[PDB]
Design a protein around this ligand. Structure first.
Ligand code: C7J
Ligand code: CL
Ligand code: CL
Ligand code: CL
Lengths: 99, 99
């Protein structure tokens, strides 16, 4: 698809059996989602943004589906005010900026 | 241009006759730059990030070049970790996401 930027670029993602709304976010290195359960190993991480840092749990090798596009990658879970899909997963669905 | 997302989408901007580096950030509503001088009067704004809110100065109708593309619009100035070009200016330069 071609996604306009007049509005926030929200999409539905399928992850861990759940459907969530998330922001396609080229300024995020990493995908960060609100509190949820995921399976397997994780390690603590601090990530930083406008306003400072938050602590998250880093899960690796998590399957996700975005707009029909399957991918696998790292998902950070913690107290983000909004769900963001970061570059680590945007690359995998072949997402580019164009102008 | 078409910009892939394997690295941060950093571009050169020009504002007030000076070159800076900034991040093309589809997850930002608003453009926010690190401390700098701009002309005219400013209004107050709070903007909300991953780690909470910060106070910024809002300047309106500021000329800014982004990757050589000419825009004129609102620039927020404050203690952001990184210069970000948000959707308010990405729309002026005809930017879309595509996959
Ligand atoms: C997270 C969005 C809801 C909004 N944010 C833009 C977002 O792309 C934000 C931009 C940014 C970049 C580097 C450092 C600080 C902030 N990205 C972001 O927080 O990414 C997080 C998760 O991935 C990491 O890679 C970048 C930072 Cl260090 C971490 S923002 O808080 O920075 C923001 C909010 C409003 C405006 N007008 C501008 C920016
Ligand atoms: Cl990854
Ligand atoms: Cl590619
Ligand atoms: Cl504007």
């Amino acid at each position: 698809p071609q996604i306009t930027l007049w509005q926030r670029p929200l999409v539905t993602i399928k992850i861990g059996g759940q459907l969530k709304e998330a922001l396609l976010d080229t300024g995020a290195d990493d995908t960060v989602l609100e509190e949820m359960s995921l399976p397997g190993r994780w390690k603590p991480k601090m990530i930083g943004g406008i306003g400072g840092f938050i602590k998250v749990r880093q899960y690796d090798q998590i399957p996700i589906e975005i707009c029909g596009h399957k991918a696998i990658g790292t998902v950070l879970v913690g107290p983000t005010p909004t769900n963001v899909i970061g570059r680590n997963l945007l690359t995998q669905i072949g997402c580019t900026l164009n102008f």
